[model samples]
Target: QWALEDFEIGRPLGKGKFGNVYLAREKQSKFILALKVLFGVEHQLRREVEIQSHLRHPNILRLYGYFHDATRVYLILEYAPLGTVYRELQKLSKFDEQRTATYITELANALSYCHSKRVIHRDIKPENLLLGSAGELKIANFGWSVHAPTLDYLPPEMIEGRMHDEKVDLWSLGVLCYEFLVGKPPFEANTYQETYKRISRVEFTFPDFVTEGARDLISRLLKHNPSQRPMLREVLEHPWITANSS
Candidate 1:
């Protein structure tokens, strides 16, 4: 039931179609948070608020509370000051094995937690990820996420319109792993059709710089059959993640 007078809004953190997310501080306690002002959408807003507000994990972004006016909805969320992973990757091009492994570990742990709550995060990518002030990973956006896959990250099952489940996220994880190491997604081509062809075929190769363990792990996750993909627990215990993640 917070109102505009309760917070001191600062600079814009991000902008979107509906509205912008601004940095803000609670007037009473001086607690810093991101204030997301939405000018539209009912179902999507309700879904995200229900999911994120109940989730309690270090890697998941926290939705503290929400309030609204006649024309706008305000959401109070945890402030991840370091910005999105996409921005960091853009500057560095690619991540080293250790860093990538740590990120993977964090993501897998978060996914495991979500799944336990019967939630599915369909979209897992650098663009939807943010970093805390201490450089820890945080899953930020949950709009497309049901509890969901994208073009470059979709598995064969989804591309073919077959019955799919949470295993699709494993495929996305594999692609993300490749992107982290190679600076691009694994199944990219000149055209969208060709990209789909590659994805349907599960056709991809590791760069020379990718280590043996990393290669094996990615291959394990990106299997043609969703059933063959490793579980989040298996991913956490994989040699690459275990050895590189601290």
Candidate 2:
């Protein structure tokens, strides 16, 4: 039932590595959504569709089926008006503890759901996160996610090219926490090698402005041992999350 003729395209939404997203409306239902037209199809693209399509959580961006032409594939996605979390971060520079904690809580819930489904989101950065009309978080971009499987947020194991599992997401969540409050990733450095060394050694310092509760949470999640990282549900129960998640 999906075809180019079935919808009316509007202004451009945003662009990504493989595609450009546009605002579009379904003519019959008058429904609004984002139309992501990929440049070309590949096995990764198909894997993305298969994984994202089956995911059914409010915090996860919706993939409302797809249709493609000979030259391109079109994905129908939920249109989150506030756009990328990165855009909002650019404006605010950094978020207050309350907001950052709230976001972390929501992400924990979403990631818990994802893990339960055996999906590990390999990419979990502000760029891959979206905000809905009510300003709720929505995780997007499944290009790198793998089923059983799978950033400055990269755990030491991943940086070393060792085997990784769901704990990698937890490590990223830790990085996201710091980035949200500090305006940048924890292990970022002037040189790539220095950053890698910092990540490998688990070296990072918190700004004086960061609260003790938040610092504790970040520290716990950023542990170098993947096996020791707290699970998503454990993240939800963290003192900082429980105190500030409103």
Candidate 3:
């Protein structure tokens, strides 16, 4: 197994619940790469590989290759050194409207592409958005992702219990946009139980700090009835989105 000494410290890039990402240089071509190390026996490692292998988007983290030893798996990916949107928010109090709009556009475009290919990025929060050195955004973490009709949304049939599609990802994108501008998730609660209750009820209120246009967009996306939520295509066409495009 590769030990701590095998990895160079200056190459450390980021951390996640299960692994650490490092910027490494391949010996042959000296090509820079992002290496993700996860415990091999763990089920999550395999699922992540399977899910990421099928996803393709300029604004999504790209998996290049994977290798395994008896105890660990190493995933080679495109390096995004600027870190996650969550870390960026900690450095800057909050993103301004235009900045938020730009990120929203990029995320929406990426999600739209995923939906087109019948993939659902079930999780779309700021914590999962990585920024490259060039200031470009990319979606990371495919652990929760799945194929089409993979319970993407909590539909009325599913509200009781059934399957849904990628519109759920659009809802998450809306929530993420709100959090980006406000510095907190829209449906946050003090405890998991409370959070689940609020989520099931689709209960959220727009803080007065948010603009009317932004609030309108959030409400439409967070609607409890999945059928009532706007599709990503329509979301891209919304005034809040297109009005700021330049």
Candidate 4:
């Protein structure tokens, strides 16, 4: 087990209820990484350790290792120096097809790999995504993510109080697709009551500005029936996704 003294912390990347994530370098490897100072229940921490350790993907953020201060846990992670996609999206007025397609492609690729491992990222929001300086996408936040139910990404089956699987992420990808183009969630409203009602009915609105291919892909992903959604492999073959290679 690593210890707190092994890392030389420098700056803060993000601050959340768990604790702050800092930019640091591990003394042994001299690898620059993010150190997450976490304060949470033992159960949540254990679950995170289990889920993150087994998951390794190019686009998925890496959780190298961890240590603790008896009261707080210190986690070593990949350094996404370019920062969270949420901040980036907030700066952008809207997304063009090229940018959206690129992000969606990488997102799908990562999700596909996770599903193959029987892991599901229940939350796929801009807040959880990070970008490289070159504008490359990375799914950085998986805090108890796999198969954990969340409101926006929660599929119809979840609302029905039933078991769900990888399709939940497909639903979130749809939400992600819509938000990238539209700047907000499709089912977002003033209150949870209204939002739940909208999501329960799988109600979402598409702006006219979204390209046909983008719209079509999002629709297929956000399908009311989880089984009706495309597999991540199938999503990669989509016109919106393939358009990038050329």
TM-score of each: 0.93, 0.96, 0.87, 0.92
Candidate 3 lDDT over residue span 1-246, tens digit each? 333334443456877666787778765556676888776435654667787876778889988768777886688788887888888898896887778878888888888888787777776777789987778789988776767581222322343455767777766777787777888776677876666666777777766789898888878888776788888778778887777643
| Model 3 residue 167 lDDT score | 70
Better of 2 and 3 by lDDT: 2
**Candidate number with greatest TM-score:** 2
lDDT for each residue of candidate 2 in 114-194, tens digit (9 for 90 to 100) = 999989997899999999998989999998788975147678998798988999999999999999999999998888889
Clashing residue pairs in candidate 1, if any? Answer: 120-147, 121-147, 121-148, 122-148, 123-148
Please, what are the lDDT tens digits per residue for candidate 1 over residues 39-153?
Answer: 7457776888888899999999999989998998898999999999889999999999889999999998998898888787777889889999989999977876675324887
TM-score of model number 2: 0.96
Ranking by lDDT: 2, 1, 4, 3
Superposed model 1: Cα runs more than 4 Å off: 147-150
Model 4: per-residue lDDT, tens digit, 103-183?
Answer: 888888888888777777676788889876576888866665654434766677877778888888888888888888898
True lDDT of residue 48, candidate 4: 68
- Candidate 2 residues lying further than 4 Å off, grouped into runs, are none
* Backbone clashes in model 4: 0
* Local accuracy by lDDT, each model: 0.88, 0.90, 0.74, 0.81
